[PDB]
């Protein structure tokens, strides 16, 4: 069943330097922010 | 009388040396310090700076002047601590260990302020600790247990081995921001060198001596290349017994 | 391999040891 | 405990203290509290096990200053108060062999000879338990293991273990990606092949 | 102390005890 | 080894 | 330990007992040092 | 047991605190920790503030909120600004990689490994991780295919040439040695 | 000590009058009683 | 159980050598394993009640700690005397439980104790750490235990048990200490 | 500060082995190098048996003053040391090139650009200000250009580890801030001289080397870098480099056929 | 709750039997457990143990 | 996500599912991985992840560690000293005389059974007079001795007998009995 | 009995005058010693000299009437003087005679100017100067000898720097037997009371 | 002495003070078991229902 059908690649962290700086510009965190406020209102699903 | 007294100034005898006016200067001074003490009461947040166990009134002998310590412990460390403390709360971090931080925080970003503020704590508040005033002489166990690594056929080899060797990994470290430490792997001793904004409990060593090879820490006395100097003084004033119960400790 | 064996069955396992030793030790200069 | 009363000798054993010190044996974190058990486990007369030796040998080729002599002269030891070796503790005795190169040529050859003797022992005993279950597909993967330690050590399986491989096979396809499998297995990669 | 008499308080004692509370 | 036994060890 | 006498059970077989030795140097007769010793040790208390 | 808390002040607080639970919980998540100041006692003293500044109650409401998002904007920006250096200090791992991680320790459960196959995994993984290679080709026969892999030391390497393949891209000004 | 307050050593410790005049009361009550 | 009296040579000699009579009680059930003797319920009894000898003290402590709203600060030198000599009270039967805990919510403390404490608490429940820390230590520093953690310990287990426990930190009057009807 | 005499020694040393990338020359510019040297695979070069930087028998930094380790040098601690040598003086040459304070003409096309990016200078001033001020460590604060996104977004600001190039990421360099803690001490130290919290000393370190910054000198940078992203050699050398990966992808693939 | 419970019983119960691959002769598993644990009993895999089947 | 519904309540059940794999045999797989990572921030990075997904490890090291920084930190500014009480109240949890104090606790419910008896019980046989006069000192530690291996069970099997064969060397046979009704058969 | 002995120690015990934070150790909402926070604070720093250690370093092994028969030539000092006052300053912590303090700084004068060749410009020296009257070392500022404290009763210092083993003693047994007893017995072998 | 309601001998709560969850799960807090924790967040200070007409 293994046969009929046919995650440890190395991933380093300074190759994603751009996608770091996206979000340090206050467009994404006015979003973060806009988000996190959204999310902030009291939920009374718990489940 | 103690409480009454400002933070920084000192209790004495009356010489009656005083002009009326600086002693009206004074008394100004101790009116905005009280103002500065009332606000400092609520800025103040979970984690505090360490209480110094021995007098650094003075500088720490052999060591550092009075300016070059207090440079470390009201300048930068104060500082550490603020940024630890604004990131600490707000977070699900809040009250509680130093260590459940420093634990909870390590190996990420988006996190990576609290963490290097945390570890920072850490490393000042050990480093503190381990420094005695005027230098203590390495005890008979640790010492044997130190000649059994280090120590090439000579007598407390170990010794000037050790006190090379961290030398060494001080000047091997170019960064100039970070910590000198001598750990117990668990299996061994050894001299790591950690960058700023990492600790020994991080990677779950078991710390027995800090050095501060941040260049914030010598550069008002030894200067910009006076760093082998600065080491070699720290040997003059560290604290041995402390690194020798604590191995004793891991051990059993 | 016909001697260490014999030597470990019949009580000597050092013996056998070092003359194994001794036989790779003997292949090796044989076969280079 | 040492029995006292009938009703307590009748929990008792050799065989099973095994898995008690074995129990004990994994619980140390470090070799040199576990050679005090292994010890008495030895003295005080112990069957023992594949398990005491995957956790002996594993954490003796860890301990940093070991000198790799006595590794193997262990495993040996191990063997003559009859544990069956298997897979995991030959592949540690493989991975030990690798790391040390610090010895001399005739003493890493001795144990080569050895170790590949090994290896073709157990994947005999392997094909023989697995061969009347009709397992093929399992079967082919043990053999693919086998075979790549193997090659590591700069042999392959013998002749010999082909046979009484072969004889045992099921479906055709199978047989001949056997006979395939054993000729490569003496030519390198590069190899010129039709 | 590293004269004869102290040579000869190891090898037998009893007798320099003995010639010190003599002598 | 009767030294080994009866030895002070100053000198 | 061993099978030297102390200056200890010679008192004893002598029948002395330590007030005796008044003139002499040693304190604790139960040391093992010769006189030299002994006086050398409580040099600076005279 | 009497609350000092008078009706207008439960009132107030309360809905304070049903509008954001971030500002309700900040002080006391776990246990309450009553040597520091705690944002919904500073909101509710500014709220007074405005109200005495002649603000009415929805205004000052929202307002005094405002602040509060906004200093927490301020701290969650920094947290990023580092969390971004942090990162190509290399030694820090956001979710992306910790995948990898878990992906090691799955892969580990999932077919029970021998110490020997383990150190093996180790050393060509650090084969892939450091020579690795972007842009590999399948043979499909005639017709090969080549498609883009995953990160490397090498193409870590190639992304600071601009993938010319060569140190000297830069004309710019800098210091220079004889 | 080593048991209650209102019972001592033979059933439940009399306090009132009642108790001292009709005292089957201070040991028995229904089919279920113990010591 | 007729409490014996202390007496002449004898008896002060049989109170010199007694011993541990925690850990006797203990080898003489567990000696109940030796192939010549069985296992005893009476020797286990005996064990039982040596170890909680003091037992219901404990008790006592829990509701000193758990069941008083603002007990003050309870670090300060003062209620901490109150608590000290309250507890050596309920131990040696010099008291009530019922009579204690009365005597210790009706202590002495500070003027204007309820308008010093809306400068703290909203509804008045301090916080139970001071409490506990402080219980302890009456308990070690007075004698009470033979072995130190004893102490701590099980006045620690008995509070979390009951956490869990509807309205927990709540009491009927009459149940709650030593009154002529009881719990079973 | 300058580190010329110490790489003025490393480097004949070093020359033999980057012959991949050039051979022995006269001129050889420290940005060139940074990036030469800048990324070591361990698998490749590994610390030479004996690494007397290993077994901490020489300090990295004393790796410089004895000649037995220059006869027959460890590679990656060599390069190491160059690296962090020619980043770092790279990064104070750069700093005294972008630290004249003297001419307070503000030219248009930077403006131009600029607010077309931020929305005023203003914002550039604000954005260089918090990422000088709010770092994780003593390094310096770079102002930079990529040419990925620059269409969008030409500029931007990266506050690099210690004294690290920005060349490394691949980045045009623009501008620098120092931030470290050198000038946070003598700064803390010229406050309490004259005729206090950290954070906000560090930041006024931040705000005002903002304000001594010389935009010409960012106007010829930035206009260096648009020239060069325009130039056809970049697509040529792009092309046959990438040519040489696919190659190679082949020939790989097909040495185990 | 208890569909969580279940849920997360029946899971790893699949990745007890779903985690067999190179677990005949694997690591995953003692020798020891492979001596007493694979015979079928009441835990394991009864017949059924109970009546009016 | 990953590993699909592998869950484990701790560090060392993990370690028990891939049987002979500790800290640092991953800590090579994930110092390969991320370069730049040490050899002991490496089997760190293990340790934390396990020690996310499942609960924190128990070991006598990371209790070290808490001391350690304990007493790094030292007294603090809080009023009653109170993260200091919660800290020390905390830390004397994991000390021995605490475990002994548990055991006792148990015992006090009868949670045991005759084998833990007779197991406390040959465990006291085997102290001296000395050896009791010497851990009577601590006034708790002899009552660990002997309750030692019930607290161990407290705080944290042989499947079927095998034995050896019985045959007559000679005519290799061996003997069994089998009977019903005890009489009958 | 036991609570009037209780009562007798914690009333001879007990502490008066004011400790450093102006209170008595009676006094009603403020304490002192909070959780053994001296104890450790003793702990962690020790009580010893500098000098101590120097002198202790460059001495040795040798005798010690012999150095102080030495360091006087016939006519420099009674001998029974500095040897009262050495045995005063190493054990017994003391400010050492100036007597002592000459003698010793014409001993140790290379190790006290290798200790003190390094230090910046406003950090503490260690100088040997009598030029003032007293000897009570709070009042050089502890730069005379290398002292933290200002005083330390002398039973506890003894205790403190015997603990160190370093102390030398006194074994008038054979000497390797000593050591091997030392060694297997451990100082466990006081544990027991037989 | 009675409530009103149903008579009971105490007022109902669930929770009363402020630190008894941490001192209840005190080593869970210290190893750091409790960080990221929901059960002690929600319902700390929870408190029933007001049922009364
Ligand atoms: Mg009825
Ligand atoms: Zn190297």
Same mark, same amino acid.
């Given at each position: $069943?293994? *046969?009929?059908? #046919? ?6 962290? $300074?190759? *994603?330097?751009? #996608? ?28 | ?252 | ?32 | ?194 | ?23 | ?11 | ?46 | ?178 | ?35 | ?184 | ?257 | ?53 | ?185 | ?194 | ?53």
């Amino acid at each position: $069943q293994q *046969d009929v059908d #046919n995650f440890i690649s190395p991933q380093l962290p $300074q190759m *994603d330097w751009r #996608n770091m700086s996206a979000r340090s510009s206050e467009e994404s965190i006015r979003e973060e922010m806009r988000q996190l406020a959204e999310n902030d209102v009291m939920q009374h699903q718990r489940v | 009388y103690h409480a009454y007294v400002p933070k920084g100034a000192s209790v004495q005898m009356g010489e009656t040396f005083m002009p009326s006016n600086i002693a009206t200067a004074v008394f100004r001074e101790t009116e905005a310090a009280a103002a500065r003490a009332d606000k400092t009461k609520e800025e103040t947040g979970f984690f505090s700076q360490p209480r110094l166990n021995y007098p650094v009134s003075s500088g720490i002998p052999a060591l550092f002047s009075k300016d070059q310590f207090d440079m470390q412990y009201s300048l930068f460390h104060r500082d550490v601590v603020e940024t630890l403390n604004r990131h600490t709360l707000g977070t699900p971090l809040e009250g509680h260990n130093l260590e459940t931080v420093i634990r909870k925080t390590s190996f990420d970003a988006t996190q990576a302020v609290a963490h290097t503020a945390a570890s920072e704590h850490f490393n000042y508040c050990f480093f503190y600790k381990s420094l005695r005033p005027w230098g203590t002489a390495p005890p008979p166990r640790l010492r044997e247990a130190l000649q059994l690594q280090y120590g090439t056929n000579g007598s407390a080899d170990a010794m000037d081995e050790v006190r090379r060797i961290v030398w060494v990994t001080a000047a091997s470290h170019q960064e100039r921001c970070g910590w000198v430490y001598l750990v117990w792997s668990g299996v061994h001793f050894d001299v790591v060198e950690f960058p700023h904004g990492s600790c020994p409990i991080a990677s779950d060593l078991i710390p027995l001596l800090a050095l501060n090879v941040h260049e914030s820490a010598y550069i008002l006395d030894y200067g910009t290349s006076g760093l082998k100097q600065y080491v070699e003084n720290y040997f003059k004033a560290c604290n041995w017994p402390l690194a020798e119960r604590y191995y004793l400790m891991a051990i059993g | 391999n016909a001697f260490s064996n014999m030597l470990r069955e019949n009580g000597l396992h050092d013996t056998a040891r070092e003359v194994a030793l001794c036989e790779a030790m003997n292949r090796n200069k044989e076969l280079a | 405990l040492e029995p006292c009363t009938p009703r307590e000798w009748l929990q008792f054993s050799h065989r099973n203290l095994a898995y008690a010190y074995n129990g004990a044996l994994r619980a140390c974190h470090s070799l040199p509290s576990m050679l005090l058990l292994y010890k008495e486990m030895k003295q005080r007369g112990v069957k023992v096990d594949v398990d005491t030796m995957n956790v002996l040998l594993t954490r003796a080729a860890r301990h940093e200053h070991i000198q790799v002599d006595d590794v193997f002269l262990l495993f040996d030891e191990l063997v003559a108060l009859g544990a069956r070796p298997d897979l995991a503790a030959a592949e540690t005795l493989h991975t030990v062999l690798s790391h040390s190169a610090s010895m001399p040529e005739e003493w890493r050859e001795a144990r080569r000879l050895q170790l590949v003797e090994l290896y073709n022992n157990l994947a005999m005993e392997e094909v023989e338990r697995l061969a009347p279950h009709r397992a093929d597909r399992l079967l082919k993967e043990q053999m693919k293991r086998f075979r790549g330690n193997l090659q590591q050590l700069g042999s392959g399986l013998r002749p010999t273990v082909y046979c009484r491989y072969l004889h045992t096979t099921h479906t055709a396809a199978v047989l001949l990606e056997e006979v395939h499998n054993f000729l490569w297995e003496l030519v390198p990669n590069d190899h010129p092949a039709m | 102390e590293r004269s004869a008499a102290m040579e000869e308080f190891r090898r037998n004692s009893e007798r320099y005890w003995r010639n010190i509370i003599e002598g | 080894v009767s030294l080994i036994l009866s030895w002070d060890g100053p000198g | 330990d061993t099978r030297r006498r102390t200056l200890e059970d010679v008192l004893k077989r002598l029948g002395k007992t330590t007030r005796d030795l008044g003139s002499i140097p040693i304190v604790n007769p139960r040391v093992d040092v010769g006189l030299p010793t002994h006086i050398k040790r409580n040099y600076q208390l005279h | 047991d009497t609350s000092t808390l008078s009706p207008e002040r439960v009132a107030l607080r309360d809905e304070l605190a049903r509008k954001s639970r971030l500002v309700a919980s900040e002080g006391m998540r776990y246990y309450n920790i009553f040597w520091v100041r705690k944002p919904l006692d500073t909101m509710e003293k500014e709220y007074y503030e405005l109200k005495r500044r002649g603000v009415d109650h929805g205004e000052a409401i929202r307002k005094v909120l405002q602040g509060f998002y906004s200093g927490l904007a301020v701290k969650k920006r920094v947290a990023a600004i580092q969390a971004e250096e942090a990162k190509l200090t290399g030694r820090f791992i956001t979710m992306r990689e910790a995948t990898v991680v878990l992906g090691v320790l799955a892969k580990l459960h999932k077919e029970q490994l021998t110490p020997h196959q383990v150190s093996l995994l180790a050393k060509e993984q650090g084969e892939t991780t450091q020579s690795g290679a972007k842009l590999t080709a399948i043979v499909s026969r005639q017709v090969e295919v080549k498609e883009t892999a995953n990160d490397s030391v090498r193409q870590l390497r190639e992304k600071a040439e601009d993938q010319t393949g060569f140190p000297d891209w830069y004309t710019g000004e800098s210091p220079t040695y004889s | 000590r080593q048991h209650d307050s209102g019972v001592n050593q033979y059933g439940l410790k009399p306090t009132n009058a009642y108790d001292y005049i009709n005292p089957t009361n201070l040991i028995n009550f229904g089919r279920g009683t113990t010591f | 159980d007729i409490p014996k009296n202390l007496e002449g040579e004898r008896s002060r000699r049989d109170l010199a050598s007694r011993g541990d009579t925690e850990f006797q009680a203990l080898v003489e059930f567990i000696e109940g394993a030796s192939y010549d003797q069985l296992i005893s319920g009476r020797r286990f009894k005996k064990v039982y009640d040596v170890l909680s000898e003091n037992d219901d003290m404990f008790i006592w402590l829990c509701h000193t700690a758990m069941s008083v709203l603002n007990p003050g600060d309870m670090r300060s030198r003062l209620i901490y005397n109150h608590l000290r000599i309250l507890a050596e009270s309920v131990a040696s039967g010099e008291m009530t439980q019922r009579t204690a805990f009365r005597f210790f919510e009706s202590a002495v403390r500070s003027p204007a104790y309820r308008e010093i404490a809306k400068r703290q608490l909203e509804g008045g429940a301090a916080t139970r750490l001071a409490g506990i820390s402080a219980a302890a230590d009456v308990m070690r520093r007075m004698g009470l235990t033979r072995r130190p953690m004893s102490s701590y310990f099980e006045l620690y287990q008995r509070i979390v048990e009951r956490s869990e426990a509807m309205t927990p930190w709540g009491f009927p009057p009459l149940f709650q200490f030593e009154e002529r009807l009881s719990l079973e | 500060l300058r580190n010329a005499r110490e790489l003025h020694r490393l480097l004949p040393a070093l020359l033999p082995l980057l012959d991949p990338p050039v051979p022995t020359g006269a001129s050889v510019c420290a940005a060139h190098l940074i990036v030469a040297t800048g990324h070591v695979s361990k698998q490749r070069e590994p610390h030479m048996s004996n690494c007397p930087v290993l077994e901490r028998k020489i300090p990295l930094s004393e790796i410089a003053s004895d000649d037995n380790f220059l006869k027959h040098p460890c590679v990656p601690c060599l390069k190491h040391r160059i690296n962090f040598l020619a980043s770092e003086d790279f990064c104070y040459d750069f700093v005294e090139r972008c630290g004249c304070g003297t001419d307070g003409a503000l030219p248009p096309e930077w403006r131009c650009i600029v607010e077309r990016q931020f929305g005023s200078m203003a914002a550039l001033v604000e954005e260089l200000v918090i990422h000088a001020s709010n770092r994780r460590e003593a390094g310096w604060t770079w102002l930079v250009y990529d040419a990925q996104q620059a269409g969008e977004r030409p500029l931007l600001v990266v506050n690099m580890p210690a004294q690290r190039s920005p060349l490394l990421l691949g980045l045009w360099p623009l501008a620098v801030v120092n931030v470290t803690e050198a000038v946070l001490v003598e700064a803390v130290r010229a406050e309490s001289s004259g005729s206090k919290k950290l954070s906000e000393i560090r930041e006024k370190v931040a705000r005002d080397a903002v304000s001594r910054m010389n935009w010409g000198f960012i106007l010829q940078q930035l206009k260096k870098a648009e020239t060069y992203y325009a130039s056809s050699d970049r697509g040529e050398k792009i092309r046959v480099h990438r040519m040489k990966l696919e190659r190679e992808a082949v020939t790989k693939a097909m040495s185990g056929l | 709750t208890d569909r969580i419970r279940r849920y997360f019983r029946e899971l790893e119960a699949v990745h007890t039997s779903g985690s067999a691959s190179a677990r005949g002769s694997g690591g995953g598993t003692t020798a020891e457990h492979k001596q007493q644990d694979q015979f079928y009993s009441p835990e394991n895999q009864p017949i059924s143990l109970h009546r009016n089947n | 996500r990953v590993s699909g519904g592998v869950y484990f309540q701790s560090v060392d059940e993990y370690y028990a599912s891939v049987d002979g794999l500790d800290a640092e045999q991953i800590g090579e797989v994930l110092a390969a991985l991320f370069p730049e990572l040490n050899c002991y921030e490496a089997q760190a990075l293990v340790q934390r992840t396990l020690e996310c997904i499942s609960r924190p490890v128990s070991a006598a090291s990371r209790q070290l560690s808490r001391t350690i920084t304990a007493e790094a930190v030292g007294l603090d500014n809080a009023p009653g000293h109170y993260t200091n009480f919660l800290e020390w109240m905390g830390r004397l949890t994991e000390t021995r005389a605490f475990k002994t104090e548990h055991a006792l606790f148990e015992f006090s419910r009868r949670k045991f059974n005759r084998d833990d008896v007779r197991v406390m019980f040959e465990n006291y046989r085997l102290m001296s007079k000395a050896t009791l006069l010497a851990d009577s000192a601590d006034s708790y530690s002899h009552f660990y001795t002997v309750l030692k291996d019930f607290a161990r069970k407290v705080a944290g099997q042989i499947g079927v007998r095998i034995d050896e064969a019985e045959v007559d060397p000679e005519t290799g046979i061996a003997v069994g009995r089998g009977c019903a009704d005890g009489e009958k058969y | 009995m036991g609570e009037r002995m209780r009562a007798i120690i914690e009333d001879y015990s007990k502490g008066f005058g004011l400790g450093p934070h102006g209170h008595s150790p009676t006094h009603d909402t403020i304490h002192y010693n909070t959780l053994n926070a001296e104890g450790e604070r003793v702990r962690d720093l020790g009580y010893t000299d500098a000098l101590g250690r120097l002198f202790s370093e460059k001495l040795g092994d040798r005798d010690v009437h012999q150095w102080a028969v030495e360091s006087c030539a016939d006519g420099e000092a009674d001998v029974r003087q500095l040897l009262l006052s050495l045995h005063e300053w190493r054990e017994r912590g003391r400010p050492p005679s100036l007597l002592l303090a000459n003698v010793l700084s014409k001993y140790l004068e290379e190790e006290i100017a290798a200790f003190n060749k390094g230090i910046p410009e406003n950090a503490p020296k260690l100088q040997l100067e009598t030029s003032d009257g007293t000897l009570a070392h709070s009042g050089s500022g502890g730069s005379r000898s290398g002292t933290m404290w200002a005083d330390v009763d002398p039973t506890t210092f003894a205790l403190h720097q015997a603990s160190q083993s370093t102390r030398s003693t006194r074994c008038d047994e054979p000497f390797i037997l000593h050591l091997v007893k030392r060694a297997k017995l451990g100082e466990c072998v006081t544990n027991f009371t037989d | 002495r009675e409530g009103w309601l149903f008579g009971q001998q105490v007022q109902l709560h669930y929770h009363r003070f402020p630190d008894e969850q941490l001192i209840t799960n005190l080593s869970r807090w210290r190893t750091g078991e409790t960080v990221g924790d929901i059960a002690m967040q929600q319902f700390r200070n929870a408190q029933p229902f007001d049922i009364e007409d």
